[PDB]
């Protein structure tokens with residue numbers, strides 16, 4: 001396989017606090033975590049560097065490895081392909097870093113079908129009303145999108161109860177509380193990443 | 197029918213500028229536009245008032261008028277129903293106001309099936325790259341959600357070319373330019389709303 005710390009799959013409804021928890025996790029563990037570099041077929045832009053911003057490849061090569069099952073997520077628009085390869089995730093693992101995969105539910109099931117063996121964590125709000133208060137606070141939603149988000153979050157919370165889907169489900173009632181649970185769930189992989 | 201100004205249906209990819217255009221439209225035309233008040237079956241919260249924040253009704257009543265085809269959009273979570281009724285839209289029209297319907301593509305087709313006769317306007321970015329620059333600027337997206345938004349916006353731009361779907365398609369290259377086109381498209385309904 002690929003030796004190194006197991007990746008972490010982070011999922012949950014938008015606005016529940018998984019970004020706030022992740023930012024604190026990174027700021028308190030520099031050199032421990034990493035993010036996979038995406039593949040694309042579009043042209044590089046000023047300042048971009050291969051292997052850091054993207055892996056720049058041809059459409060023929062990218063399509064070949066999509067068919068080979070490498071890509072846990074991929075999309076296409078304006079004739080250019082984009083995606084995240086399991087090989088790019090293993091490349092972070094090879095550097096003795098915990099690769100962080102912040103994905104929705106469809107991404108979880110795509111990762112479940114690969115040879116990757118990550119830890120699956122769901123960050124859920126304590127209630128739909130708290131999530132509504134959270135979403136109304138950031139002032140990003142119409143009435144249509146706010147209600148659509150709350151309804152979609154309900155199905156997200158319900159699918160989180162599916163047996164074996166997630167290793168850890170964190171209810172973000174208190175942030176300091178939720179963050180401590182996140183660290184404890186990752187404590188063994190953090191220790192492995194702390195090795196040379 | 198219901199006499200008064202025709203409602204306006206505003207659609208387009210998130211981040212293309214339809215909220216910025218709408219805010220300027222409201223701030224330069226007070227008393228001219230209005231927003232429909234939604235129906236819900238949930239309990240009122242502190243400070244909320246019937247007929248202003250929501251129309252509070254029973255589940256039996258709301259289900260009856262959903263089956264009657266009143267609701268251009270509706271959703272349910274935690275045992276409570278939410279939705280926008282064509283009657284609430286006509287109630288804004290009855291006050292000689294232009295009712296603003298800011299909805300996605302599915303909302304457009306739901307409105308198309310009612311007795312409402314609004315003006316259908318699509319606000320599109322000049323390119324997907326401009327939209328990406330716009331989305332990256334507001335710092336709300338993961339890499340997964342950013343690419344998903346760009347791909348979804350491509351299908352949104354493509355469906356905007358569907359014959360007869362939209363009365364006006366506004367390409368938001370320059371904001372002052374796009375806003376002037378928005379005012380001109382609504383100039384006759386604004387004049388009607390300016391009548392007593």
Ligand SMILES: Nc1ncnc2c1ncn2[C@@H]1O[C@H](COP(=O)(O)OP(=O)(O)O)[C@@H](O)[C@H]1O
Nearest residue numbers: 013014015016017018019020134137138172175
């Ligand atoms: N721990 C928390 N307590 C209260 N509100 C929160 C918390 N975390 C997030 N929010 C609200 O949710 C919004 C976005 O949450 P975020 O941290 O991005 O979670 P996610 O990554 O799941 O969207 C924030 O603007 C804030 O208003």
Ligand SMILES: Nc1ncnc2c1ncn2[C@@H]1O[C@H](COP(=O)(O)OP(=O)(O)O)[C@@H](O)[C@H]1O
Nearest residue numbers: 209210211212213214215216330333334368371
């Ligand atoms: N006219 C514009 N020119 C440049 N950037 C814009 C413009 N309108 C919107 N944006 C970018 O898009 C983001 C949100 O756009 P918004 O006005 O909410 O459009 P929408 O309502 O379609 O989401 C803004 O934070 C801004 O970065």
